Amino acid sequence: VRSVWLDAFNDPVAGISAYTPCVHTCNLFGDGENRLVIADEDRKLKIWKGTQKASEHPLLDTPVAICSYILPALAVAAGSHIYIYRNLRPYYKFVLPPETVITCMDVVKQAIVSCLVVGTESGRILILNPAAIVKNIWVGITPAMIAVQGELDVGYRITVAGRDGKLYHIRNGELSQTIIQLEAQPVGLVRLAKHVAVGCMNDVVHAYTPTGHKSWSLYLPCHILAMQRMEVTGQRNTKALIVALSNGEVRVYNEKLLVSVHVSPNPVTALWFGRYGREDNTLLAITKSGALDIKMLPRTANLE
């Protein structure tokens, strides 16, 4: 009903043109205070610290996704290349052997240091060395978005939403035969506590266990623009879901229960929840108007 959030800071006139896969927070400068990392459509990589833009750096191609793994390593994908950078400066220009275009990329925990995971328009999913293409897994369809849960040592699951409106699962290297046929097309894919949340073009989020059981369903008034996990650690210990709609509103569901609503003057293209600055529970949103909005969650705010 109300908004749980504290309004931290707003910059209407930031110049940011990015969607969720190209937004990130990391501890690059090791100094505890985390920084916002954006691969803008500028083909420029922008770095934010606190309320002000810290740095800007040129990128060769226009970006599709940026991850950060293990101290830190900013990895920018574009086309068929993946440029690993180090200490803000460029470091390497890896290229996947085609037969190619990179569609989505994310990371997997090595044990309990992480390892880069890549989706290619070809229909392959690659897991790589802590710097070379280590695993190549074939899935029928062109991946629309992917999510990783687990650690590659003990055991891990890779969920794939296909452009064919299907849901794919990969448990420990093998592509399962369990394929779910969804109505509309994929729009976002967020890994939660007991399941993954898929959002379809017909304004609905579905929650799916790896088995294929459908835990719940969320029915939304307008169109989904962005989805994102909101992991609050500590006593409150919940893994919420943030959905932002083209009608401007941003919602937090604790499982099936709507927990907060606020509305941005502009439609959110990118959502990030994590550490930024010295605060653990920070919501960073980038609007289509290019604005940057930061809200952060009270200590006492319950999400039931």
Partner: protein
Amino acid sequence: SKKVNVLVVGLDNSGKTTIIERLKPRPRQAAEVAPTVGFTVDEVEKGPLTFTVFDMSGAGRYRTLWEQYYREADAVVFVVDSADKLRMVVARDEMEHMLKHSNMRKVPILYFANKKDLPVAMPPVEIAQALGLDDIKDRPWQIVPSNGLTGEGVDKGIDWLAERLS
């Protein structure tokens, strides 16, 4: 003398500990300062007054400890890192919960607008704005810009606080 309890609170890294250093005699003071761990009770002299200074951590994890000390507090020092425009609201929220708490009496609050030296540091008046300090009308309060490295403002502040306690 007279013994009084002074609670020192504020977000992590505002400079509570550093500002508390500048209240000790100049030979006692230490060079670098470790990020407070849990909390540290200390003692300090200032004229006819003896301050028992409870220096808390302002880290997420530890904020739940401040309330342990509200009942006894006779005055509160509240440190704000002026250059952290970002967390002002968090700063505000915690301040508000403190004021709310049924244990915290209407004792005087002294806010240090610390790190006045930093390039992007916020003006005392903008800080008092974000925190909504003007709304405080049942307690004596005061905001004093400060440099905790140099010690600038600190005494001016403590001096103010001492008037109210006398």
